[PDB]
Design an enzyme around this catalytic site. Structure first.
Site, PDB file in Angstrom:
ATOM      1  N   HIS A  61       0.838  -1.206   0.000  1.00  0.00           N
ATOM      2  CA  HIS A  61       0.000   0.000   0.000  1.00  0.00           C
ATOM      3  C   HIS A  61       0.873   1.255   0.000  1.00  0.00           C
ATOM      4  CE1 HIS A  61      -1.766  -3.254   2.533  1.00  0.00           C
ATOM      5  NE2 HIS A  61      -2.518  -3.344   1.397  1.00  0.00           N
ATOM      6  N   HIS A  91       4.377   7.361   7.014  1.00  0.00           N
ATOM      7  CA  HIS A  91       4.229   6.952   5.635  1.00  0.00           C
ATOM      8  C   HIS A  91       3.694   8.091   4.818  1.00  0.00           C
ATOM      9  CE1 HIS A  91       0.463   5.959   7.829  1.00  0.00           C
ATOM     10  NE2 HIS A  91      -0.220   6.347   6.727  1.00  0.00           N
ATOM     11  N   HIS A  93       1.223   9.176   1.155  1.00  0.00           N
ATOM     12  CA  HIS A  93       0.145   8.859   0.229  1.00  0.00           C
ATOM     13  C   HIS A  93       0.453   9.839  -0.878  1.00  0.00           C
ATOM     14  CE1 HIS A  93      -2.348   6.487   2.948  1.00  0.00           C
ATOM     15  NE2 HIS A  93      -2.047   7.353   3.956  1.00  0.00           N
ATOM     16  N   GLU A 103      -4.642  13.189   1.047  1.00  0.00           N
ATOM     17  CA  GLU A 103      -5.945  12.634   1.361  1.00  0.00           C
ATOM     18  C   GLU A 103      -6.827  13.764   1.849  1.00  0.00           C
ATOM     19  OE1 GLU A 103      -4.720   9.420   4.134  1.00  0.00           O
ATOM     20  OE2 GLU A 103      -5.397   8.294   2.359  1.00  0.00           O
ATOM     21  N   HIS A 116       2.166  11.201   7.049  1.00  0.00           N
ATOM     22  CA  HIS A 116       1.433  10.898   8.265  1.00  0.00           C
ATOM     23  C   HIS A 116       2.384  10.292   9.269  1.00  0.00           C
ATOM     24  CE1 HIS A 116      -2.554  10.188   5.757  1.00  0.00           C
ATOM     25  NE2 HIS A 116      -2.395  11.517   5.929  1.00  0.00           N
ATOM     26  N   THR A 195      -7.124   6.190   7.279  1.00  0.00           N
ATOM     27  CA  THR A 195      -7.572   6.441   5.922  1.00  0.00           C
ATOM     28  C   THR A 195      -7.502   5.186   5.074  1.00  0.00           C
ATOM     29  OG1 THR A 195      -5.390   7.157   5.190  1.00  0.00           O
ATOM     30  CG2 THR A 195      -6.884   8.844   6.057  1.00  0.00           C
ATOM     31  N   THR A 196      -7.176   4.073   5.724  1.00  0.00           N
ATOM     32  CA  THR A 196      -7.078   2.772   5.071  1.00  0.00           C
ATOM     33  C   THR A 196      -7.716   1.743   6.016  1.00  0.00           C
ATOM     34  OG1 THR A 196      -5.007   2.048   6.113  1.00  0.00           O
ATOM     35  CG2 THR A 196      -4.792   3.496   4.201  1.00  0.00           C
TER      36      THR A 196
HETATM   37  C1  LIG Z   1      -2.492  -0.023   6.804  1.00  0.00           C
HETATM   38  N1  LIG Z   1      -1.693   0.848   7.663  1.00  0.00           N
HETATM   39  C2  LIG Z   1      -2.906   1.361   8.283  1.00  0.00           C
HETATM   40  C3  LIG Z   1      -3.335   0.495   9.469  1.00  0.00           C
HETATM   41  N2  LIG Z   1      -2.356   0.537  10.550  1.00  0.00           N
HETATM   42  C4  LIG Z   1      -2.522  -0.489  11.395  1.00  0.00           C
HETATM   43  C5  LIG Z   1      -1.453  -1.359  11.634  1.00  0.00           C
HETATM   44  C6  LIG Z   1      -1.620  -2.433  12.501  1.00  0.00           C
HETATM   45  C7  LIG Z   1      -2.845  -2.629  13.119  1.00  0.00           C
HETATM   46  C8  LIG Z   1      -3.900  -1.735  12.854  1.00  0.00           C
HETATM   47  O1  LIG Z   1      -5.086  -1.841  13.381  1.00  0.00           O
HETATM   48  C9  LIG Z   1      -5.319  -2.944  14.294  1.00  0.00           C
HETATM   49  C10 LIG Z   1      -3.751  -0.669  12.002  1.00  0.00           C
HETATM   50  S1  LIG Z   1      -1.936   1.898  11.140  1.00  0.00           S
HETATM   51  O2  LIG Z   1      -2.756   2.168  12.350  1.00  0.00           O
HETATM   52  O3  LIG Z   1      -0.520   2.044  11.626  1.00  0.00           O
HETATM   53  C11 LIG Z   1      -2.268   3.127   9.988  1.00  0.00           C
HETATM   54  S2  LIG Z   1      -2.265   4.808  10.283  1.00  0.00           S
HETATM   55  C12 LIG Z   1      -2.949   5.008   8.731  1.00  0.00           C
HETATM   56  S3  LIG Z   1      -3.335   6.556   8.171  1.00  0.00           S
HETATM   57  N3  LIG Z   1      -3.195   6.585   6.698  1.00  0.00           N
HETATM   58  O4  LIG Z   1      -4.662   6.845   8.569  1.00  0.00           O
HETATM   59  O5  LIG Z   1      -2.431   7.352   8.949  1.00  0.00           O
HETATM   60  C13 LIG Z   1      -3.162   3.894   7.998  1.00  0.00           C
HETATM   61  C14 LIG Z   1      -2.770   2.813   8.713  1.00  0.00           C
HETATM   62 ZN   LIG Z   2      -1.771   7.599   5.937  1.00  0.00          ZN
END
Ligand SMILES: CN[C@H]1CN(c2cccc(OC)c2)S(=O)(=O)c2sc(S(N)(=O)=O)cc21
Ligand SMILES: [Zn+2]
Ligand SMILES: [Hg+2]
Length: 257
Positions: A61, A91, A93, A103, A116, A195-196
């Protein structure tokens, strides 16, 4: 699984993650005219001087630079926050073209990309617990606009060759995240979600007013990453961003006038 393709994109995520149509989802459009400037808003406290980066990896991703969040090494305090949020990873986007990638949008305006810096509320113990609380996470969003090269970003751009495809990683120690921060710490804040997928609504969003500038060739390298894994048809990692969501019964508070 999910993705950003026509067949597994944001418009299909609700089927597997109903929260996609929840009440406090991100990103959102930041309407600067109706965002309430709140004066009781304390300034941000970003303490990345002891930040310890470990590695960088392509996860299908995007690429993430992970940090050693075993102790209070890089934390975010102040602002709209109460408690200390520990940095775990950051990371980006980005888009296939310069006029898209962020985003969050400002007055509907999109930026080339968005950084982010993900933090988790230490009062919860570990990360996995923080994601079970409405104030479990704090994400610092920073807009990247194309222009002059951001020096501190080049170290990341150089390593992107060794993690072209999904699953790859590389040691990425001694990286100072402070080189990615704008000059001003002015921000906007509201309650939102990831956001994912899994799209959890545990995030307190802090989106800095001031964007950073990165060169065309810098962000160009981002576009050379691969969604796919080695030995699979090449699928360029571009446009790994989600469209804005309804603000609903939420208000955006600015820490500035
Ligand atoms: C795919 N990576 C995303 C999910 N991640 C994640 C990882 C491990 C466990 C979990 O949920 C149990 C979530 S994350 O919380 O570190 C983040 S932060 C983020 S954003 N774009 O909103 O900042 C997207 C993601
Ligand atoms: Zn993000
Ligand atoms: Hg949550």
């Amino acid at each position: 699984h999910w993705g950003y393709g026509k067949h597994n994109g944001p418009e299909h995520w609700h089927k597997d993650f109903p929260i996609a149509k929840g009440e406090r989802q991100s990103p959102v459009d930041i309407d600067t005219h109706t965002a309430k400037y709140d004066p009781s808003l304390k300034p941000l406290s970003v303490s990345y001087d002891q930040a310890t980066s470990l590695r960088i990896l392509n996860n299908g991703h995007a690429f993430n630079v992970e940090f050693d969040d075993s102790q209070d090494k890089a934390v975010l305090k102040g602002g709209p926050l109460d408690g200390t949020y520990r940095l775990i990873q950051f990371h980006f986007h980005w888009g296939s073209l310069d006029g898209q990638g962020s985003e969050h949008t400002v007055d509907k305006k999109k930026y080339a990309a968005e950084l982010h810096l993900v933090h988790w509320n230490t009062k919860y113990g570990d990360f996995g617990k923080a994601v079970q609380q409405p104030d479990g996470l704090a994400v610092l969003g920073i807009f990247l606009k194309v222009g002059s090269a951001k020096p501190g970003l080049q170290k990341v751009v150089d390593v992107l060759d060794s993690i072209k495809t999904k699953g790859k990683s590389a040691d990425f120690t001694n990286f100072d995240p402070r080189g990615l921060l704008p000059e001003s710490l002015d921000y906007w804040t509201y309650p939102g979600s990831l956001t994912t997928p899994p799209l959890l609504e545990c995030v307190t969003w802090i989106v800095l007013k001031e964007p950073i500038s990165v060169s065309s060739e810098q962000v160009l390298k981002f576009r050379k990453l691969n969604f796919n894994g080695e030995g699979e048809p090449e699928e360029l990692m571009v446009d790994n961003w989600r469209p804005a969501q309804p603000l609903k019964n939420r208000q955006i508070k600015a820490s500035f006038k």
